[PDB]
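Journal club prep, notes for RB
We'll compare a predicted complex against what the paper describes. Inputs for the sodium ion case:
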Amino acid sequence: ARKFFVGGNWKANGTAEEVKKIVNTLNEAQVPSQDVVEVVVSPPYVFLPLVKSTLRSDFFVAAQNCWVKKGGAFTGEVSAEMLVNLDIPWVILGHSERRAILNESSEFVGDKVAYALAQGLKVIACVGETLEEREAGSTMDVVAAQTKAIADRVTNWSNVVIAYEPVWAIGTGKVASPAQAQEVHDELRKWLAKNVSADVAATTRIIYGGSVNGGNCKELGGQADVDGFLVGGASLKPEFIDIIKAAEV
Amino acid sequence: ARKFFVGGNWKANGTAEEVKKIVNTLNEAQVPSQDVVEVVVSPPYVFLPLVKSTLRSDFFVAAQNCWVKKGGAFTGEVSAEMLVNLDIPWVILGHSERRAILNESSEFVGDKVAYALAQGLKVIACVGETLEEREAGSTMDVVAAQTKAIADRVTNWSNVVIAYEPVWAIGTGKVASPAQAQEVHDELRKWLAKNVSADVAATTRIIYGGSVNGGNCKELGGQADVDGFLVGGASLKPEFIDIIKAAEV
Ligand code: NA
Ligand code: NA
């Protein structure tokens, strides 16, 4: 069985004082065993050392991004080998905000995923379609193209988690149903089965990166092809604990 | 007189161990008084807390970049108010590598400079032309356009330093002379005098962001319109101290 996976993407948020409160809340949290849920928290770069040094050893830390290749003359960028040096085990790559606002191409994201895996990082690789793309009938064309750019550059999937972001439901007034999440997760897993292998499809976590809260986490988590969540805003809040508890039997 | 300014841009380089060695070397350095030189060091985001907590209080820390506006849903980005929270006083904005490789437009850079200044950061604002631009006769057209995008968005220049990067001499086999640096600095200061004010032109540091080393720092530093340096690779090395010492009488 695929181990339920809950990632918390803090995005471009936080102060030393708020990070200390968030970490203190996660440290005091009582959640399902390490055998039933894998928990990853992703602060901004400048708080990665603070979080890694103070967070409970059974929760894991992710960067929100890293550079496409070896460090050097890339002012403003953080290399995968910097994260490895700081004992940061995870990285989020290809988040919808970087694809849309920072114009990260599917090929750029694929190159990042390959380089991060080569340096020993574990990767949350993000995909997802816009409202225009979904309304054009392009959902699986887009998600397959984005996934293919990663798959063409990846030889080992052990350290990959795919996050599906329904960008079409994020800020548009459109709401994704658990059935709509399940449909994309199922079609994406079928795509992995045909284009990579049956093994990789059966063992790769595909997590839901739409609007996740205490109200919807159990119904979403119970979907056959949803293996967990990449949580946004709720990741800064005690409610993140309730979302981790979606793993419980 | 304009206070000589030496910035060290570490770029996408460093490990905890190497940062500790670099900081220990700067802490042991014996350089001209705070009255004659202002020294700024710019590590990657993930090392800003380590450097700020351990670096001598008379040297200052800069981020290599920050986000264009208020933080929030910008996965991978670091806001100016995050840097202010961590007591990081400086930021480098519009570095040639971000303009060229990350496609930061002159308007994007100008917006960043305005937002960073609004949050209380001091800014090293970078400009400079490519070999193609220089060989086309566009040097001052390009540098003026880049500076104008910043100037159109800035009302107070007290906390700005302009860095001229001769991108045309950085990796091309072309070498910039001190006379060539002086010509651009002079034309850029004249531009500030006409387009902003005589006061702003007379008081704004314009630093040279070309190839700077112990061999050339005194001749470059002595130019009438060169007020210091934005150093690259040498900023990781003991040689950075010799470049700071270019301030000496
Ligand atoms: Na499930
Ligand atoms: Na000078």
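Talking point for the session: Chain B touches chain A at residues 9, 11-16, 44-46, 48-50, 64-65, 67, 71-79, 82-83, 85-86, 92, 95, 97-98, 101-103, 232 (CB under 8 Å).
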